[PDB]
């Protein structure tokens, strides 16, 4: 069972908070996007651009129950996995950390090289799923990673 299951918007800090919290607890991180495109040997784009939302999410589900079931480390849920049904049932009992970041900063961490408008929708479609499965909310706007780690662990 994962010691923590971190969820929240892209650029909430799933990997980054995860890599770090995994090192402090002494465990390994497992990313479900990594799990999926690993133990299918196709890229997530290969799956969407090839069999669609519906199959991918069913694939995502199945993979994330697996990792919920026998990853004993820290688990980062692929960002839209809390839409899938099977995935909200499965987090029931785990320790679930919701990383809150507001839409400006969420847009900023996500950079690379109107997009922010597509981010408010992602926010409005998921945020209240994130609260719905959350067993714990850490607001991350103003904290640095170490600080998000120590707030988390002190509640853990």
Ligand X SMILES: Nc1ncnc2c1ncn2[C@@H]1O[C@H](COP(=O)(O)OP(=O)(O)O)[C@@H](O)[C@H]1O
* Residues placed in the known binding site for substrate: 33, 57, 79, 126
Of 3 and 32, nearer to Cl ion (C-beta) is 32
Q: Which residues does residue 100 pair with via DSSP β-bridges, in sequence order? A: 139
Nearest position to Cl ion, beta carbon: 79
Q: Which of residues 3-42 bind a copy of itself (CB under 8 A)?
A: 10, 15-16, 19-20, 22-23, 27-31, 33-34, 38-42
81 makes contact with a copy of itself (CB under 8 A) = yes
Minimum distance of a copy of itself from residue 155's CB (angstroms): 20
145 makes contact with Cl ion (CB under 5 A) = no
Q: Which of residues 37-96 bind Cl ion (CB under 5 A)?
A: 79
Residue 34 interacting partner from a copy of itself, Mg ion, Cl ion, none (CB closer than 5 to 8 Å by kind): a copy of itself
**C-alpha to C-alpha distances, 115 to 68, 100, 107, 109, nearest whole angstrom:** 32, 19, 8, 13
Q: Which residues contact ligand X by CB under 6 A?
A: 8, 10-16, 79, 109-110, 112, 140, 143-145, 148
Q: Which helix (H) or strand (E) holds 100?
A: strand 96-100
What strands lie across the sheet with 29-31, from one edge to the other? Answer: 29-31, 74-76, 4-7, 96-100, 136-139
Give the contacts of 134 (CB within 8 A, at least 6 positions apart): 7, 96, 97, 98
């Amino acid at each position: 069972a994962p010691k923590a299951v971190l969820v929240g918007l892209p650029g909430s800090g799933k990997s980054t908070i995860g890599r770090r919290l995994a090192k402090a607890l002494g465990v390994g991180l497992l990313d479900t996007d990594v799990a999926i495109e690993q133990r299918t040997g196709r890229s997530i784009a290969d799956i969407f651009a090839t069999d669609g939302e519906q199959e991918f999410r069913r694939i995502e589900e199945d993979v994330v129950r697996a990792a919920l079931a026998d990853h004993d480390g820290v688990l980062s849920l692929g960002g839209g996995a809390v839409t899938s049904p099977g995935v909200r049932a499965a987090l029931a009992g785990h320790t679930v950390v919701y990383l809150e970041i507001s839409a400006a900063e969420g847009v900023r961490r996500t950079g690379g090289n109107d997009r922010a408008e597509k981010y408010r929708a992602l926010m409005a479609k998921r945020a209240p799923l994130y609260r719905r499965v959350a067993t714990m909310r850490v607001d991350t706007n103003r904290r640095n990673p170490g600080a998000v780690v120590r707030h988390i662990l002190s509640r853990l």
